[PDB]
């Protein structure tokens, strides 16, 4: 008859599929090139994780030109977007914090602040 | 490295933001029009949830054998909200769309009821 059902592992499963598409460049409408290093991603996932990309792809206005401080910092930001996990080291936290601050991703900023305070 | 930061509520947040995009017709490259009603979606989300849409998007370039908009609506609601609402008025319409798109997680859900 009538019933409602919830699949708690569905969000993580879709994100893992979105990650595998990105690692293989499948259905990717966005490609970043930072000094030879390339990064393919989905514009819908970028706008879902970063308010900067939201105002760049959706609102199309009132956005400062893209500025990526470190290529390795951008890879960790995209890795967090598609895996919800972010590896942080005392030799890369500042580079990840630079890209995250420009992209207005307070979740990574809080994660970077957690490592410098809770080493 | 020396530490790994995990965000358990991230994938739920991404799916909710993707749902808000398809509900507002934002950053969507798909448009389902079945019996006069329009449905927006992302081709990357469809391939991530349906093996039929996967093969249709990673290998191929459309008319679908979708019986009714109500069954497609609830199927799209499951993709973007992880929740499936079934009632005796739509369980047959949902299973029809679920079997064509080859999503046995939904197929088994309605096979019981």
């Amino acid at each position: 008859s009538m019933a409602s059902m919830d699949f708690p592992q569905h969000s993580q499963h879709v994100l893992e599929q979105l990650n595998q598409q990105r690692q293989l460049g499948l259905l990717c409408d966005c490609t970043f090139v930072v000094d030879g290093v390339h990064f393919k991603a989905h514009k819908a996932v970028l706008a879902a994780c970063s308010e900067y990309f939201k105002m760049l792809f959706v609102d199309q206005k009132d956005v400062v030109h893209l500025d990526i401080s470190n290529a390795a910092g951008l890879g960790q930001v995209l890795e967090f977007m598609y895996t919800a996990k972010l590896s942080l080291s005392p030799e890369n936290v500042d580079d990840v914090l630079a890209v995250a601050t420009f992209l207005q991703m307070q979740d990574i900023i809080t994660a970077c602040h957690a490592l410098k305070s809770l080493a | 490295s020396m530490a790994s930061m995990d965000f358990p509520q991230h994938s739920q947040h991404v799916l909710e933001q993707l749902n808000q995009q398809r509900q507002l017709g934002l950053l969507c490259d798909c448009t389902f029009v079945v019996d006069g009603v329009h449905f927006k979606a992302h081709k990357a989300v469809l391939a991530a949830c349906s093996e039929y849409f996967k093969m249709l998007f990673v290998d191929q370039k459309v008319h679908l054998d979708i019986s009714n908009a109500a069954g497609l609506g609830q199927v799209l609601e499951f993709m973007y909200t992880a929740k499936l609402s079934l009632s005796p008025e739509n369980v047959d319409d949902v299973l029809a769309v679920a079997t064509f798109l080859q999503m046995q997680d939904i197929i088994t859900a309605c096979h019981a009821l």
Binding site: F32, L66, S69, N70 | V33, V34, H63
Partner: peptide, 21 residues
Amino acid sequence: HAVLVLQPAVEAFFLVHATER
């Protein structure tokens, strides 16, 4: 009994030099 309109896909490339001053 159904239509699926797919918008054409053009790739958005963003080529940037790193600002590691």
